[PDB]
Ligand binder design. Structure first.
Ligand SMILES: Nc1ncnc2c1ncn2[C@@H]1O[C@H](COP(=O)(O)OP(=O)(O)OP(=O)(O)O)[C@@H](O)[C@H]1O
Ligand SMILES: Nc1ncnc2c1ncn2[C@@H]1O[C@H](COP(=O)(O)OP(=O)(O)OP(=O)(O)O)[C@@H](O)[C@H]1O
Ligand SMILES: Nc1ncnc2c1ncn2[C@@H]1O[C@H](COP(=O)(O)OP(=O)(O)OP(=O)(O)O)[C@@H](O)[C@H]1O
Ligand SMILES: Nc1ncnc2c1ncn2[C@@H]1O[C@H](COP(=O)(O)OP(=O)(O)O)[C@@H](O)[C@H]1O
Ligand SMILES: Nc1ncnc2c1ncn2[C@@H]1O[C@H](COP(=O)(O)OP(=O)(O)O)[C@@H](O)[C@H]1O
Ligand SMILES: Nc1ncnc2c1ncn2[C@@H]1O[C@H](COP(=O)(O)OP(=O)(O)O)[C@@H](O)[C@H]1O
Ligand SMILES: [Mg+2]
Ligand SMILES: [Mg+2]
Ligand SMILES: [Mg+2]
Ligand SMILES: [Mg+2]
Ligand code: NA
Lengths: 244, 269, 267, 259, 267, 244
C-alpha cells in the first residue's frame, strides 16, 4: 500500500454546525484546542454549517447545478476556518488555502503546531452529478486528506454524541438509538439521514490507511481530547482498512 | 416537485443526507449555463503526443468550426503522465499525489495547442473559476483548457492501485455536464469503440452505438473511456450521451460538431 | 504649474497644506466616463432568489445594448450571520471584513453564472484587470461589492461590524473610474421618512441632499452611513440614485437617466 | 478613582476586540529613512539584527521619495486618488524587499499583503521577524477628497497593529519626532520639539506633520494601542530604546483608555 | 528528420552538438506574426508625463484600428533610484531585478488606465494568458517590459545593475511570438554618433548593423547592450526600429513599416 | 562583491535523469537526504530528465520556439520536485513554487531543515533565442540561485561519476577519460557533450561567490554526503571566482 506522507499528523474536522453555535460552543472548543497544541500536531479542518444551506436555497431557486453549489458551500467552510484560526492566532495558528494544504503542509507544520483549513475539497465545477446537493462535503474532504496523508487519525467533531439509528433532532427522534460502534459498510447499506456525508462511506471503502474514525460531541468539553488519545467517547466508524 | 417553502424548511432543519431533503432538491429548476457550447477533448496519447501530423489538421478544423459552434477544447495528458505515474506509483505514492503530476502534463498540452491557436484569438483558460470562459466564448467562440479535474490531493482513488481514476476524460466530461453544454465529443485516434482494442486485435468489430450497461456487460467499461466516466454519464443531468470520433480522419470533428454520427455514440441508457 | 507641484512633492511632507492644495489643482481624468456602476442588493435582491433575480437579469441583458455596466453584488443574510458569529466572539472589524467579502463573492458568482451565456464575466483580482476588455466587448461585468480593506478595514466608532461594506465598495469603484452614474438597486422605491417595512405611514422622499438626510436622522437608513461622507468627498460621482429592482423597468429607466427612485445629492 | 467610576448605573465600555498577536511588536520604517541608502540602512540593519532575539517583529516599510515621483507623473496624467494609492504602495513594497534581503541570513523574508492579513501567525512561529509593506491595500477603494492618497504607511501600520492588538507600534523617522513646524521647512527657525502629544491635539492643528493625518483619525477609533512613539532611526539605539518603552522621541497618545 | 531528432533527444545530452543541430532543423512556427511589439520608454517617455504620454495615447488609439499592438513599458528614473539604493547596499543583480520590475509595472498601470476606455487591457502573469483574446478583440494590450528573471537574472560582467531590462524584455517577447516588427519609442530621432543631449557633434545614424554599432563604441548607447546580441541570435526579429515618440506620427508611420528613425539590423 | 544573502545554505541539484530511474535510485537518495537534514540546511532543486525530451520532441514537431519549450521543460523539473518532496514530507520537507524560492526562502528554512524547488529558472517566454533547445536549464538555474544567495556550496547530483572527455554512454564511450577536476573556462573552450548545461559555464564566468561546483554520482550512496563535506568524490568545476 502507499507510503504515509505525514504519519504523525492528527486530523480534526470541526462541524460547521458546531461553529454556528457561536461563542457558547466556540470558546470552550478554542480552549480545548489550545491545550491540545503541545500534545499533537494538528490539521484542523472546518465544515460549512447553516450558511451553506442558505446558499443552496438561493442557488437551487436560481436553478444552479451541483458544480455551482459546491464551491459556494466550500466558501462557508473557509469562513469558519478563518474565524477559528483567528481565535488561535496568538498560539501561532493561521488558516491556509487549499493549495497550501495540498503542497506545503509539511513545512507549515514544522513552523507551528497547528494550521486550519477548509474541510471541503476543491472539486468546484468538477463535483459529481446525480444529486443536486454537492456529495463531497466536509467529512468527505477531511477523510480524503487524512487517508492520503496516511495520518494517525481523523476525528469528527459534531454537535451530537455520535451516529444514531435516526436523526436525534428529527421527526423520528423517539426511535433514535445510539450506535457506539459501526462499520462504513453497514452504514452505507442503510437508508436515512446520518451526521456524516454518505460519500464519506464511499471513500472509506477505498481507503488505504485510516482504520477508524470517531464522531464525538464537540459541545462536551474533553471528548475531543479523549478521542485524540483513542478513548471511546462517541461513535467509532470502522473503515474496512484492515490492520497488520 | 414539492415547494419552495418545503425545500427551504428541509434545507434549514435536516442533514443534507436526509432522503427527504435530497428528493426536494431534485425538484429544483435546472439552469443550463452554456447551453449552446460544445466540449471537445483532444486526446493526449491519441492525438497531441502524435505531434504535427495529428495536431495541425485538427487545428484547421477547430479554426473553421468556431465560425458555427462555441467550443470548449480540453486536452488530454498522455505518455508523459504515464511516465510520471510509473515513477510515482513505484515509490508508493498515493493517487492524490499522482493526480497533481497528471494535471501538469495536461497543462503542457493545453499550452502547446493554445499557442497554435493564439493568432486566431483563442485563449488558454485556467484558474479555479475559469473566469475567462464567458468573454472568450462570446467573442472568439472557443477556449482551450487543461482536461484534468482539479481534485489534486483530494482525488478519489480507484478500488485497486494508485493511478488516478478520474483523468482527462472525466475532467472534460464534467465541464460539459456542469455548463449544460449541448454535446461532448472525444477526439481520439480510432473510429470509436471496438469489441477489442483495434490496435492489438486484427478482427475486432466496430461498435457504432452502445449503452453504458451494454459496455459493462461486454467488459468494455475501461476500453475507450476512463471507466468512471460511464457512471458519471448515467448520473449526468445535462449530457446523457457522448460521441467518440477519429481525429486522424479529416472532417470527423467537423461533422460530429454538426451533430452527425461518424464514430461511436455512447448513451447513458 | 507642474514645476511648483513637482517641487513641493519632493521637498515637503505629503501632509503639507501647500502640497495638498497644489495637488488639488491637478487635471482630472475619468477612466470609464461612459460606464455606469450598479449595485444589486444582497439582502434586498439576490437573497430573494429567482423571483427577484431573473427579471433583473433580463433587464441587464437588454440594457447592455445601450449602456456599459459594472454590476456589483451585495452580501446580505449570510454576511449578517457571519458577522453575528464573529462579533459574538469579539473579533475585530478587520477580521469580519474578509467574512463579508466571501459572501459578496458568492453572490457575484451566482449572478455571473446566470449571465455567462450572454458573454458577461465575473471579474476580480486586486487590479480588476479584466474590466476594460469585457466592458468594450460585451458592455457589462459582474464584480463583488466588498472593498478590499480586509484586516486594514477602518472600524466604526463602536462595535466591530465593518462600516464600509458593499454600498461603499460599489460607490468607490464608480468614483475611482469616474463613471457617469451610480445606481443602487434595492427592494423599496427609495428613501422614506422611516423604514417603510416597519413603519405604518412613512413618507416617500424622491430627492434629498446628504446634509438634509443627516438632519432628518436618516444617515444610516437606505445606504451605509459612511457612503454619504464619501459622496460629499467624491470628485466624480456627486449624486446617486436608489431604485426598486422588484418593479420591472426601474433599472432600465434609471440607466437612461430617468428620476425613478430617490436621488441623493452631495450638495 | 473618580466618583463617576463608582456609579454602578452608568454605561460600561464594551469589551475590547480579542487580540490576535498580543506579543507582537510592530515597527514602521519610514521610506525617507530607506531613501538615505547604506549610510542609514546598514546601522539600522545591525540594530534590527540585535533586536531579533529580544522581540518578535513585524517590520513594515514606508514609500519615500519614489512615491512622490510616481505621484508627480500620475497627477500630471490626471489620475485619481485610487490610481495613485497602489502606485505608492508598490514603493513601500520595494523598500520592504530591500530591507528583508539585508536580513535574509537571519531568516527574515518580505511577505505580500495576503500573507500579512492571513498567515502572519504561522510565519512568526517560523522566524523572529518578517517584513511587509506598511501601506494598506486600499487600491481602487482609496477614499476621495484629497488627490493624495490619505491612508499611507503610518496609517496602514497602525491599522494592522491595532487590529492585531499588538504590544506596540514604533514609527522610525528621519527626524527626532514631531515639531510645531517642519524642522526642514521654510519655518524651521520656529520649529519646537514636542516630546509628547495627543492625537486629538494634533488633529485640530493645521500644518505639516511627519505622520499621516489619517493616522490621527484611525487612532481615534483605536481599541488597543495606547501610544505610538516617533523616533529618529538615524540615531543608533533609539529604536532599541523605544521598543523597551524609553522616551527618546515624540509619544503620541491615541486616546485609548488604559486601566 | 523527425525520427533521428526523436532518437537524439532520447539518447544524448541536450548539450550534444548533433542533437543541437537536429533541433535547429525543426519547423519554425510564428505565434503572433501579424502583431507588433512597441516599447514606450520609461525614462524617455512616461517619466515625462502628460506632454509626452497623451499624444502617444492618441496615436495608439488610432493605430490599433489598423495594427495589432503589444505595448510594453519601460521603468525609468524610479528604477534608477532603486538600483542606486540597492547597489550601495551590496545587493546582487538578482535582487535588483525584482525592483525594476515593480517600476515597469507602475508605468504599465498608468498607461493602461489612459487606454481603459478604449477597451485596451493591461496584461501580466507568467503566461500572459490575456493576450490572444485582447489582441483579437481590441487589437492592443499593455504589458510590463521587464523580463521575469527575478533572482535568476544573469548579472553583467561588472557591477550589479540588471543587464536585461525593459529593452530586452520587450525584444524577447517580439522574438518569442514571431512578431513582424519591434519598435522602440524613445525621445530622440534614433541613434546618433554620441548622446545628442550631451554632444553638439552628435550626428544622426538612420541605419546600422549590430557589428557596426559595436565597432563605433555604441553597443550600450540607445539600447541595453545585450539586446544587440539577442538580436543577432534571434530567429524571427532580425531588425528593430527606434523612433522619436515626442514627434507626432512617428509611431504611426513606423507601425506601417516606414523607416522614420533608426533601423538596427542583426547583420 | 555583493553581500551573501544565505551564506549558510547548501544547494543540491538532483538530476532529472536520476529521478527517471525511479525507486531503485530515488529510495537510497531519499535515505541519504534524510540523514543530511540534521547536518545541513538544504535547498534541493530538481532537474527535468527524459520527460522534457519528450515534450521537446512534440513541441519542436509542432514548430514551437524556444521560449515555448522552456516552461514546458521547467514543468517537468517541478514534477520531479513534487515527487521528491512527498518522499521527504514526514521530515517537514515541501516543494515550493518559484516565487517562494525567490522571496520567502529565508522564512521557510527557519521553519524546516530543507525545501525542494525546481532547478529550472522561470525564464518562460523570455528564454534566449539561438538554440531551439532552451539554454538556461536545471544546472544553470541552480547555479544562478546558489551564487545569488552566496550559498556555501552547489553540488550537482548526476547519474555518472562526473565529467568525461566524451559521453561515457555515447558512441565514443571507449575514448571517454574521467576528469577529476576542471575549470569552467577550459570546459567552455571544449566542443562536445557535457553532463552539465553549457550555459552553466557562462554564468560561472560572471559568478560572485561560488568558487567550485562538484558533480558526483548520486547512484553511489554516500557520495552526496561526502561532497557536502568537501570530499573530492566526483568532478570539481572551478568557476574562476577567487578568494576576496
Ligand atoms: N443518524 C443520525 N445520527 C446523528 N445525527 C443525525 C443523524 N441523521 C441526521 N442527523 C443530524 O445531523 C446533525 C449534524 O448536522 P450536520 O452533519 O449537517 O452538520 P455539520 O457536520 O456540523 O456540518 P458540515 O457537514 O457542514 O461540517 C445532528 O445534529 C442531527 O440533527
Ligand atoms: N511638524 C513636523 N514635525 C516633524 N517633521 C515634519 C513636520 N512637518 C513636516 N515634517 C517633515 O516630514 C519629514 C519626514 O517625511 P515623511 O513622513 O514623508 O517621510 P517617511 O515617513 O519616511 O515616508 P513614508 O510615509 O513614505 O514612510 C521630516 O524630515 C520633516 O522634514
Ligand atoms: N562529457 C560528458 N561527461 C559525462 N557525461 C556526459 C558527457 N557528455 C554527455 N554525457 C551524458 O549526460 C548524461 C546525463 O544527462 P543529463 O545531464 O541530461 O541528465 P540530468 O542532469 O539528470 O538532467 P537535467 O539537466 O534535466 O537535470 C550522462 O549519463 C552521460 O550519458
Ligand atoms: N475496444 C476498444 N475500442 C477502441 N479503443 C480501445 C478499445 N480497447 C482499448 N482501446 C484503447 O483505449 C485507448 C484510448 O486511447 P487514449 O490514448 O487513452 O485516448 P486519449 O489520448 O484521448 O486519452 C487506446 O489505447 C485504444 O487503443
Ligand atoms: N428610512 C428608510 N427608507 C428606505 N429604506 C430603508 C429605511 N430604513 C431602512 N431601510 C432599508 O431596510 C433594509 C433593512 O433595514 P435595517 O435597518 O438594516 O434592518 P434589517 O436589516 O434588520 O431589516 C435596508 O435595505 C435599508 O436600506
Ligand atoms: N549614441 C546615442 N544615440 C542616441 N541616444 C543616446 C546615445 N547615447 C545615449 N543616448 C541616450 O539614450 C536615451 C534613450 O534611452 P532611455 O532614456 O534609457 O530609453 P527608454 O526610456 O526607452 O529606456 C536617449 O534619450 C539618449 O539621450
Ligand atoms: Mg456532520
Ligand atoms: Mg513619516
Ligand atoms: Mg532605457
Ligand atoms: Mg546533467
Ligand atoms: Na492561445
Amino acid at each position: 500500500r502507499p507510503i504515509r506522507l505525514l504519519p504523525w499528523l492528527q486530523v480534526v474536522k470541526i462541524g460547521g454546525r458546531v461553529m454556528d453555535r457561536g461563542a457558547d460552543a466556540i470558546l470552550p472548543l478554542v480552549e480545548e484546542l489550545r491545550k491540545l497544541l503541545p500534545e499533537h500536531r494538528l490539521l484542523i479542518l472546518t465544515g460549512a454549517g447553516v450558511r451553506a444551506r442558505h446558499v443552496f436555497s438561493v442557488g437551487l431557486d436560481l436553478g444552479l447545478p451541483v458544480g455551482s453549489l459546491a464551491p459556494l458551500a466550500a466558501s462557508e467552510a473557509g469562513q469558519n476556518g478563518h474565524i477559528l484560526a483567528a481565535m488561535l492566532a496568538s498560539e501561532g495558528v493561521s488558516y491556509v488555502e487549499h493549495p497550501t494544504v495540498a503542497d506545503q503542509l509539511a513545512i507549515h507544520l514544522s513552523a507551528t503546531r497547528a494550521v486550519v483549513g477548509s474541510a471541503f475539497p476543491p472539486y468546484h465545477h468538477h463535483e459529481f452529478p446525480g444529486s443536486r446537493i454537492p456529495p463531497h462535503r466536509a467529512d468527505t474532504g477531511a477523510f480524503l486528506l487524512a487517508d492520503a496523508f496516511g495520518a494517525a487519525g481523523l476525528t469528527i467533531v459534531e454537535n451530537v454524541d455520535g451516529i444514531y439509528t435516526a436523526d436525534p433532532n428529527g421527526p423520528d427522534r423517539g426511535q433514535a438509538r445510539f450506535l457506539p460502534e459501526t462499520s462504513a459498510t453497514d452504514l452505507a447499506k442503510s437508508e436515512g439521514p446520518l451526521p456524516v456525508d454518505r460519500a464519506l462511506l464511499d471513500v472509506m471503502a477505498t481507503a488505504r490507511h485510516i482504520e477508524r474514525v470517531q464522531v464525538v460531541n464537540g459541545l462536551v468539553p474533553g471528548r475531543l481530547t479523549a478521542a485524540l488519545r483513542g478513548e471511546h467517547v462517541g461513535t467509532l466508524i470502522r473503515t474496512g482498512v484492515r490492520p497488520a | 416537485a414539492n415547494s419552495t417553502a418545503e425545500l427551504e424548511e428541509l434545507l434549514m432543519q435536516r442533514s443534507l443526507t436526509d432522503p427527504q431533503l435530497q428528493a426536494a432538491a431534485a425538484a429544483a429548476a435546472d439552469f443550463r449555463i452554456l447551453p449552446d457550447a460544445t466540449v471537445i477533448k483532444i486526446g493526449g496519447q491519441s492525438v497531441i503526443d502524435r505531434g504535427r501530423a495529428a495536431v495541425y489538421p485538427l487545428v484547421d478544423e477547430i479554426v473553421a468550426a468556431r465560425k458555427n459552434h462555441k467550443l470548449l477544447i480540453g486536452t488530454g495528458a498522455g505518455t508523459r503522465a504515464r511516465h510520471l505515474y510509473s515513477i510515482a506509483a513505484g515509490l508508493g505514492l498515493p493517487a492524490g499525489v499522482l493526480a497533481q503530476l497528471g494535471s501538469s502534463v495536461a497543462d503542457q498540452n493545453a499550452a502547446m495547442l493554445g499557442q497554435l491557436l493564439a493568432k486566431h484569438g483563442i485563449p488558454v483558460v485556467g484558474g479555479a473559476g475559469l473566469s475567462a470562459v464567458p468573454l472568450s466564448l462570446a467573442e472568439v467562440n472557443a477556449v482551450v483548457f487543461s482536461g484534468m479535474p482539479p481534485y489534486k490531493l483530494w482525488m478519489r482513488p480507484a478500488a485497486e492501485g494508485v493511478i488516478p481514476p478520474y483523468r482527462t476524460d472525466a475532467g472534460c466530461f464534467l465541464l460539459a455536464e456542469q455548463f449544460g453544454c449541448k454535446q461532448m465529443i472525444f477526439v481520439k485516434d480510432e473510429d470509436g469503440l471496438y469489441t477489442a482494442n483495434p490496435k492489438t486485435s486484427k478482427d475486432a468489430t466496430f461498435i457504432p452505438r452502445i449503452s453504458v450497461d451494454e459496455m459493462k456487460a461486454k467488459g468494455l467499461h475501461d476500453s475507450i473511456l476512463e471507466f468512471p466516466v460511464l457512471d458519471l454519464l448515467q448520473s449526468a443531468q445535462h449530457v446523457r450521451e457522448v460521441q467518440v470520433v477519429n481525429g486522424l480522419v479529416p472532417g470527423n470533428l467537423t461533422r460530429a460538431l454538426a451533430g452527425e454520427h461518424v464514430g461511436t455514440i455512447i448513451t447513458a441508457s
